[PDB]
Design a protein around this motif. Structure first.
Motif, PDB file in Angstrom:
ATOM      1  N   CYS A   1       0.789  -1.225   0.000  1.00 55.01           N
ATOM      2  CA  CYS A   1       0.000   0.000   0.000  1.00 55.01           C
ATOM      3  C   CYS A   1       0.825   1.281   0.000  1.00 55.01           C
ATOM      4  CB  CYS A   1      -0.942   0.010   1.208  1.00 55.01           C
ATOM      5  SG  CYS A   1      -2.110  -1.365   1.258  1.00 55.01           S
TER       6      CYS A   1
ATOM      7  N   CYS B   1       0.635   4.033  -3.100  1.00 58.00           N
ATOM      8  CA  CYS B   1      -0.423   5.023  -3.240  1.00 58.00           C
ATOM      9  C   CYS B   1      -0.818   5.697  -1.934  1.00 58.00           C
ATOM     10  CB  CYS B   1      -1.674   4.384  -3.863  1.00 58.00           C
ATOM     11  SG  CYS B   1      -1.489   3.912  -5.599  1.00 58.00           S
ATOM     12  N   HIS B   2      -0.434   5.120  -0.796  1.00 57.66           N
ATOM     13  CA  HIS B   2      -0.826   5.706   0.509  1.00 57.66           C
ATOM     14  C   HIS B   2       0.389   6.203   1.298  1.00 57.66           C
ATOM     15  CE1 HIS B   2      -5.016   4.757  -0.084  1.00 57.66           C
ATOM     16  NE2 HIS B   2      -4.771   3.464  -0.186  1.00 57.66           N
TER      17      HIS B   2
ATOM     18  N   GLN C   1     -16.339   4.780  -2.349  1.00 56.35           N
ATOM     19  CA  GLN C   1     -15.917   5.951  -3.117  1.00 56.35           C
ATOM     20  C   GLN C   1     -16.980   7.031  -3.245  1.00 56.35           C
ATOM     21  OE1 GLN C   1     -14.734   4.668  -6.988  1.00 56.35           O
ATOM     22  NE2 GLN C   1     -12.862   3.625  -6.316  1.00 56.35           N
TER      23      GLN C   1
ATOM     24  N   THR D   1     -10.675   8.755  -9.155  1.00 58.88           N
ATOM     25  CA  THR D   1     -10.221   7.913  -8.015  1.00 58.88           C
ATOM     26  C   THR D   1      -8.896   8.460  -7.473  1.00 58.88           C
ATOM     27  OG1 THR D   1      -9.380   6.390  -9.666  1.00 58.88           O
ATOM     28  CG2 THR D   1     -11.435   5.756  -8.587  1.00 58.88           C
TER      29      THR D   1
ATOM     30  N   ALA E   1     -12.316   9.672   3.238  1.00 64.40           N
ATOM     31  CA  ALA E   1     -13.732   9.526   3.650  1.00 64.40           C
ATOM     32  C   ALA E   1     -13.826   9.505   5.179  1.00 64.40           C
ATOM     33  CB  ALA E   1     -14.317   8.273   3.043  1.00 64.40           C
TER      34      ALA E   1
HETATM   35  C1  HEC Z   1      -2.864   2.823  -5.802  1.00 72.36           C
HETATM   36  C2  HEC Z   1      -3.075   1.856  -6.986  1.00 72.36           C
HETATM   37  C3  HEC Z   1      -3.420   2.219  -4.492  1.00 72.36           C
HETATM   38  C4  HEC Z   1      -2.953   1.148  -3.838  1.00 72.36           C
HETATM   39  C5  HEC Z   1      -1.564   0.506  -4.054  1.00 72.36           C
HETATM   40  C6  HEC Z   1      -3.734   1.009  -2.623  1.00 72.36           C
HETATM   41  N1  HEC Z   1      -4.810   1.873  -2.707  1.00 72.36           N
HETATM   42 FE1  HEC Z   1      -6.182   2.247  -1.234  1.00 72.36          FE
HETATM   43  N2  HEC Z   1      -7.036   3.768  -2.363  1.00 72.36           N
HETATM   44  C7  HEC Z   1      -6.588   4.139  -3.628  1.00 72.36           C
HETATM   45  C8  HEC Z   1      -7.452   5.178  -4.140  1.00 72.36           C
HETATM   46  C9  HEC Z   1      -7.337   5.892  -5.505  1.00 72.36           C
HETATM   47  C10 HEC Z   1      -8.499   5.418  -3.045  1.00 72.36           C
HETATM   48  C11 HEC Z   1      -9.668   6.430  -3.065  1.00 72.36           C
HETATM   49  C12 HEC Z   1     -10.754   5.954  -4.021  1.00 72.36           C
HETATM   50  C13 HEC Z   1     -10.712   4.453  -4.115  1.00 72.36           C
HETATM   51  O1  HEC Z   1     -10.372   3.936  -5.209  1.00 72.36           O
HETATM   52  O2  HEC Z   1     -11.023   3.777  -3.102  1.00 72.36           O
HETATM   53  C14 HEC Z   1      -8.159   4.499  -1.980  1.00 72.36           C
HETATM   54  C15 HEC Z   1      -8.847   4.379  -0.791  1.00 72.36           C
HETATM   55  C16 HEC Z   1      -8.643   3.434   0.192  1.00 72.36           C
HETATM   56  C17 HEC Z   1      -9.491   3.191   1.344  1.00 72.36           C
HETATM   57  C18 HEC Z   1     -10.788   3.944   1.711  1.00 72.36           C
HETATM   58  C19 HEC Z   1     -10.448   5.373   2.122  1.00 72.36           C
HETATM   59  C20 HEC Z   1     -11.665   6.036   2.709  1.00 72.36           C
HETATM   60  O3  HEC Z   1     -11.572   7.234   3.078  1.00 72.36           O
HETATM   61  O4  HEC Z   1     -12.725   5.366   2.812  1.00 72.36           O
HETATM   62  C21 HEC Z   1      -8.953   2.197   2.052  1.00 72.36           C
HETATM   63  C22 HEC Z   1      -9.516   1.606   3.362  1.00 72.36           C
HETATM   64  C23 HEC Z   1      -7.747   1.766   1.379  1.00 72.36           C
HETATM   65  N3  HEC Z   1      -7.587   2.543   0.247  1.00 72.36           N
HETATM   66  C24 HEC Z   1      -6.905   0.759   1.796  1.00 72.36           C
HETATM   67  C25 HEC Z   1      -5.872   0.219   1.066  1.00 72.36           C
HETATM   68  C26 HEC Z   1      -5.169  -1.009   1.373  1.00 72.36           C
HETATM   69  C27 HEC Z   1      -5.463  -1.912   2.593  1.00 72.36           C
HETATM   70  C28 HEC Z   1      -4.232  -1.193   0.435  1.00 72.36           C
HETATM   71  C29 HEC Z   1      -3.234  -2.367   0.338  1.00 72.36           C
HETATM   72  C30 HEC Z   1      -3.986  -3.665  -0.025  1.00 72.36           C
HETATM   73  C31 HEC Z   1      -4.318  -0.094  -0.508  1.00 72.36           C
HETATM   74  N4  HEC Z   1      -5.328   0.750  -0.089  1.00 72.36           N
HETATM   75  C32 HEC Z   1      -3.528   0.083  -1.623  1.00 72.36           C
HETATM   76  C33 HEC Z   1      -5.505   3.614  -4.299  1.00 72.36           C
HETATM   77  C34 HEC Z   1      -4.650   2.633  -3.848  1.00 72.36           C
END
Ligand code: HEC
Ligand code: CDL
Ligand code: WUO
Ligand code: WUO
Ligand code: MQ9
Ligand code: MQ9
Ligand code: 9YF
Ligand code: HEC
Ligand code: PLM
Ligand code: PLM
Lengths: 223, 149, 25, 51
Positions: free
Chosen positions: A16, A19-20, A156, B9, B15
């Motif tokens: 993760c 992107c995070h 989303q 996205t 959120a």
């Molecule tokens: C880039 C390709 C990403 C990877 C690598 C991971 N996530 Fe992600 N996440 C991404 C985007 C563009 C967004 C916002 C819109 C969407 O597509 O969901 C998110 C959002 C989340 C959320 C929800 C956030 C909220 O405010 O509700 C969660 C809980 C989350 N992402 C978790 C998560 C985990 C566990 C990952 C590893 C498996 C991970 N993300 C990777 C883009 C990307």
């Protein structure tokens, strides 16, 4: 359990951070911040298989889960440890609650679904199309815990339903309607997808009129 | 078309009930105030808690948080407000957390749904966040039963 | 044909006051 | 018998009777009337709308 938090960060570092980020602050124009999202958001997003995402588009669609149940709990705990947030309901054994989330009053759940849920989806929860590219997915494959977490977290483009706006009793009744309506067989024959007049007209033209015309040519003559 | 430079996205924000802020080099995530309410206003003198997470974008040096000021009262920082190089600085204990805390002494009434400006400085920035009031995992407060009419 | 009664404005606005509630319904 | 006047004032309002199309449930029936933003509880009866 320190082992659970360390394991979750160990999955995060390899899945993760792209992107995070490493500290869950979110990479601009690539991913939002995970601070305050809570365990419920991570649990839903991973169990439904939505995450990790692979590209930027209108919506990331659903896909087979990338992590097993043990890894989801570790991933959720690590994110929960940073900023807190909502947590997935659990049963007495400590596992994710599935059967206990079914409400006993489906009639209230149906009205609540029609008022708050059947706008983006349809009555029978088959899905719908959003503004531009986005679309509401089918609800026939989501377990009750996934529906509960989706209501808690607001994926989303889905208005977040807090425990105050929708009490756990109301949420339990809502998923009862969703789970029931998925496995109730159609009473008048084939359900035809449960979308309304659109499949009915297509089935009509391709079955009744094809048979009627084909019978007519059998009875009638050419030239 | 939806997968171009302008995506739906990638521009999506968090959120949660917090505010994302950039104080030069330190990123503020989930910036919100915890304040139980009973009446339309939270009267002055009531102690509330300001919670956020500070993330250091730079991975070379460190930073320390000082002089949090706002036009809602006096903000008191207790504990080691120094953020590590590539770590986090979690202040306060939000709901669902199984020790740096921010204590605010109100001088004017506040209520949920409004935005109140806050100033965050570490060493190289003075930014305004407009921190709102957010309720955590607390259950819905009971409502008195209406009469026959 | 843009609606005449629908024009954006740049005025900031003020926070609404607390509702009181008139008696004698 | 079928013809009806669309603009006949029949709806009570704080500023005299008005037509149906000009009013709604949020139109105050008197000056200073308090109208709450009530939510639907989803159950029939037993306080379907709450504050
Ligand atoms: C880039 C390709 C990403 C990877 C690598 C991971 N996530 Fe992600 N996440 C991404 C985007 C563009 C967004 C916002 C819109 C969407 O597509 O969901 C998110 C959002 C989340 C959320 C929800 C956030 C909220 O405010 O509700 C969660 C809980 C989350 N992402 C978790 C998560 C985990 C566990 C990952 C590893 C498996 C991970 N993300 C990777 C883009 C990307
Ligand atoms: C999920 C959706 C599915 C879609 C389909 C579902 C809808 C079902 C409707 C089926 C239609 C039933 C009508 C037929 C009734 C019985 C006919 C009969 O007795 O046959 C003798 C009949 C000859 O009698 P005739 O009319 O004197 O012949 C004149 C000429 O000699 C003929 O000479 P010609 O060359 O002018 O005509 C040739 C033509 C003649 O065939 C037709 O006219 C049939 C097509 C009609 C459809 C019209 C729709 C137009 C859309 C465009 O045949 C073909 O081109 C072959 C087509 C395929 C036939 C077999 C496969 C069918 C299985 C489908 C599955 O032959 C046929 O027409 C064949 C019948 C085809 C169906 C067979 C039975 C299966 C029924 C399905 C049950 C479930
Ligand atoms: C003379 C002519 C006149 C007569 C003609 C009439 C004939 C009619 C034919 C059919 C009759 C069937 C009667 C019994 C009905 C029945 O008892 O049925 C039970 C249940 O079954 C389905 O439940 C699935 C699962 O069991 C559930 O577990 C699952 O949950 C559920 O999933 C839904 O719900 C989920 C949430 O729960 C969502 O997540 C998910 O998304 C979805 O919504 C599923 O449903 P679904 O996917 O809808 O269909 C799945 C279908 C697969 O499709 C189909 O049959 C398609 C075929 C028929 C449909 C009608 C035609 C439509 C035309 C096309 C659209 C054309 C378009 C092309 C465009 C071209 C041009 C355009 C430009 O598999 C099957 O049944 C297998 C059976 C195969 C039968 C084949 C027929 C035999 C013919 C042999 C003839 C021999 C005669 C020879 C004589 C000599 C649903 O229906 C349920 O409601 C229903 O309760
Ligand atoms: C020879 C035959 C045909 C030849 C054609 C082949 C080559 C054509 C080349 C076209 C270029 C394609 C680039 C692809 C990559 C791309 O797309 O990246 C551009 C970016 O653009 C958008 O951002 C804009 C900004 O960059 C952002 O800064 C800004 O924010 C954003 O603003 C929106 O967002 C803001 C919020 O942020 C809001 O505030 C704000 O209000 C707004 O909403 C902007 O958006 P916007 O203005 O919408 O412009 C979008 C795209 C638009 O794409 C397109 O070409 C769309 C497709 C057009 C193609 C025409 C169709 C052909 C016709 C049929 C085939 C006919 C069939 C033939 C009949 C049979 C044969 C018999 C002859 O502009 C362009 O590319 C430039 C246009 C130039 C194209 C010229 C072609 C015209 C046709 C001429 C025909 C002549 C024929 C005469 C013959 C004699 C976003 O999408 C971004 O993500 C995206 O990244
Ligand atoms: C033939 C004709 C329409 C002439 C009119 C001339 C005239 C005076 C024009 C001026 C008036 C104007 C402006 C008219 C514009 C058209 C219009 C808006 C019409 C309104 C009502 C009207 C008159 C409709 C006519 C419709 C019509 C004649 C349809 C012919 C279709 C035929 C002949 C089909 C049989 C062939 C056959 C068995 C094919 C297989 C079955 C399939 C796939 C059919 C296609 C199909 C159809 C046709 C659906 O309607 C449909 C609806 C919902 C879901 C799916 C479908 C679908 O798949
Ligand atoms: C005006 C308007 C809405 C049009 C814009 C949208 C648009 C471009 C339409 C086409 C959408 C498609 C086909 C996109 C997918 C990509 C694709 C392969 C398209 C183009 C490919 C191409 C040019 C050639 C390939 C070969 C070819 C020409 C054949 C295509 C074969 C197909 C599958 C065509 C059908 C497309 C189409 C629009 C039909 C929909 C039929 C309808 C209305 C049915 C509704 C329907 C539903 C929704 C059910 O759920 C259901 C459940 C159970 C039983 C029945 C049904 C049922 O009938
Ligand atoms: C000198 C005046 C008359 C002109 C002389 C020539 C007559 C031509 C046709 C007119 C005859 C109809 C008589 C109307 C009666 C009248 O005088 O009422 C007044 C009605 O307003 C008016 O003056 C307006 C005049 C009529 C306008 C009609 C509207 C136009 C068309 C489009 C209406 C659609 C009809 C469907 C056909 C269209 C389809 C085309 C394909 C006041 O309404 P009110 O009194 O409030 O309502 C009461 C109820 O409560 C009570 O139940 C009961 O229904 C009545 O008592 C009713 O009056
Ligand atoms: C439009 C704003 C919607 C409303 C109203 C409701 N939902 Fe929703 N839902 C919507 C979207 C855009 C998505 C997917 C978001 C994504 O990131 O992919 C969803 C998803 C769900 C799911 C998940 C189903 C699955 O993945 O298998 C469930 C279970 C769900 N939504 C339930 C649900 C309920 C109970 C609602 C009423 C309170 C409701 N949705 C409303 C869009 C929208
Ligand atoms: C002829 C097809 C050309 C397609 C160019 C645009 C590629 C990206 C489309 C998606 O998004
Ligand atoms: C028959 C087509 C007529 C087109 C008229 C277009 C008017 C646009 C007005 C705007 O507003």
């Amino acid at each position: 359990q320190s082992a659970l938090l360390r394991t979750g960060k160990q999955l995060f570092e390899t899945s993760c951070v792209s992107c995070h980020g490493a500290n869950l602050q979110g990479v601009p124009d690539r991913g939002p911040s995970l601070i305050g999202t809570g365990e419920a958001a991570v649990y839903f997003q991973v169990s439904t298989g939505r995450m990790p995402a692979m590209r930027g588009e209108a919506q990331a669609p659903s896909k087979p889960p990338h992590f097993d149940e043990s890894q989801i709990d570790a991933l959720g705990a690590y994110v929960q440890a940073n900023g807190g947030g909502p947590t997935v309901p659990r049963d007495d054994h400590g596992a994710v609650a599935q059967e206990s989330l079914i409400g006993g009053d489906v009639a209230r759940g149906g009205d609540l679904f029609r008022l708050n849920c059947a706008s983006c989806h349809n009555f029978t929860g088959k899905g719908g199309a959003l503004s531009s590219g986005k679309y509401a997915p089918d609800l026939g494959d989501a377990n009750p815990a996934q529906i509960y977490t989706a209501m808690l977290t607001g994926p989303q483009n889905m208005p977040k339903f807090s425990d105050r706006q929708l009490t756990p009793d109301e949420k339990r009744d809502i998923v009862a309607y969703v789970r029931e309506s998925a496995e109730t067989p159609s009473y008048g024959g084939y359900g035809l997808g449960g979308f309304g007049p659109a499949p009915e007209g297509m089935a009509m033209w391709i079955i009744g009129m094809v048979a009627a015309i084909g019978v007519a040519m059998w009875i009638g003559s050419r030239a | 078309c939806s997968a171009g430079q302008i995506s739906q996205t990638t521009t999506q924000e968090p959120a949660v009930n917090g505010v994302n802020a950039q104080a030069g080099q330190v990123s503020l995530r989930n910036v919100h105030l915890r304040a139980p309410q009973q009446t339309d206003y939270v009267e002055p003198g009531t102690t509330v808690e300001l919670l956020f997470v500070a993330a250091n974008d730079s991975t070379e040096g460190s930073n320390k948080l000082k002089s949090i000021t706002s036009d809602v009262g006096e903000v008191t920082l207790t504990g080691d407000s120094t953020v590590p190089a590539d770590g986090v600085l979690i202040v306060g204990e939000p709901d669902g957390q199984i020790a740096v805390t921010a204590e605010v002494e109100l001088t004017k009434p506040i209520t949920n749904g409004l935005l109140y400006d806050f100033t965050f400085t570490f060493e190289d920035g003075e930014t305004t966040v407009a921190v709102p009031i957010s309720a955590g995992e607390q259950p819905r407060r009971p409502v008195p039963p209406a009469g026959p009419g | 044909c843009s609606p005449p009664g629908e024009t954006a404005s740049s005025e900031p606005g003020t926070t609404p006051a607390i509702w009181t509630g008139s008696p004698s319904p | 018998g079928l013809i009806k006047n669309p603009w006949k004032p029949v709806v009570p309002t704080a500023e005299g009777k008005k037509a149906v199309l000009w009013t709604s449930g949020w139109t105050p029936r008197f000056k200073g009337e308090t109208i709450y933003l009530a939510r639907a509880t989803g159950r029939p009866g037993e306080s379907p709308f709450v504050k």
